[model samples]
Target: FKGLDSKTFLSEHSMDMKFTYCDDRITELIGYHPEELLGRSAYEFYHALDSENMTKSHQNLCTKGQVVSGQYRMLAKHGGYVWLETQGTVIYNPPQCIMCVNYVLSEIE
Candidate 1:
């Protein structure tokens, strides 16, 4: 895990996964200021090829209260993409939301 780094972000319970909070480290990791992602659907940043598995993972997370997004890619702010794996859990308090810790594995051409 020498090259690994992770960012934690919070989102609403709805299917859109609207971002409520994003760790500041996202700027260094993906070149996006946290503010740029706030109020946006996490789905918006997904790599097209990884869509189905990610959708399934979200469905499982919604139903089971926790799930891991197997290795996938997400769009970087500047361009291209970064490999990532994420584990998320539901926080069923008054807020009713999901929180994900996203690990950056590496980047590729």
Candidate 2:
């Protein structure tokens, strides 16, 4: 989510999965380089407190062959945390598995 606006957001990437827009403001607050995050799994940098929930949600999506959405917390590069509203959905159906796009909207406390 490194665009000036949503249209720019959609146009910039050619992701095969559905577009999930995370909060761009959170990137500003946390001093993360957005390029470092593109195409990376959210779980790779998510807060430990939220990891289990996120895994479970992913499991549900994979097992049920559908998309799922929920709220969670993610770790900031600066060693703090933020609140995130997440929505993940299946975008591409491959023979082996379903590909998903996860969108997040974050707020700083």
Candidate 3:
């Protein structure tokens, strides 16, 4: 569904999600300007239920350090929920910082 490959996509946007550096696409998905999210904790926006399931997802990326599996629901720009599939790995240099590149799989009504 995405023309952008895994690494390319993550390298481009992982920091956005990780550091809350929003972009147009980010705003399109979740609703925040790069300016608004700067230096903010990504956790500040995660839906509780998604966060919990996401915690469990850590086991995969934590051990293997690269993955493309996990399901979650995040709050949208307005309300309700947007569901996405997670794909990422523990990055080095930062050493084990995992940034899961989320792919929108569907929306929950």
lDDT of each: 0.77, 0.49, 0.56
TM-score computed on alpha carbons, candidate 3: 0.63
lDDT of 2 by residue, 1-109 (tens): 4443421112011132222343354455555565665666556666787777777776776566554546666576877666555444444443232343333455444
Ranking 1 against 3 by lDDT, winner: 1
Best by the TM-score measure: 1
lDDT of 1 by residue, 1-109 (tens): 3444444433333445888778887777788887777788888889889998888998898889899899999899989898888888888763277888887777533
lDDT per residue (tens digit) for residues 1-109 in model 3: 4344321222222433355333356565555465765566555556787777666665566677677756667666577676667676667782435565666665433
Output the number of the lDDT-best candidate. Answer: 1
Off by over 4 Å in 2: 1-26, 93-109
Model 1, residue pairs in steric clash: none
lDDT for residue 55 in candidate 3, whole number 0-100: 60
Q: Which residue pairs clash in candidate 3?
A: none
**lDDT at position 50, candidate 2:** 77
Pick the winner on TM-score between candidates 2 and 3.
3
lDDT agreement of model 3 with the native: 0.56
Candidate number with the higher lDDT (2 or 3): 3
Clashing pairs in 2: 20-103, 22-104
TM-score of 1: 0.85
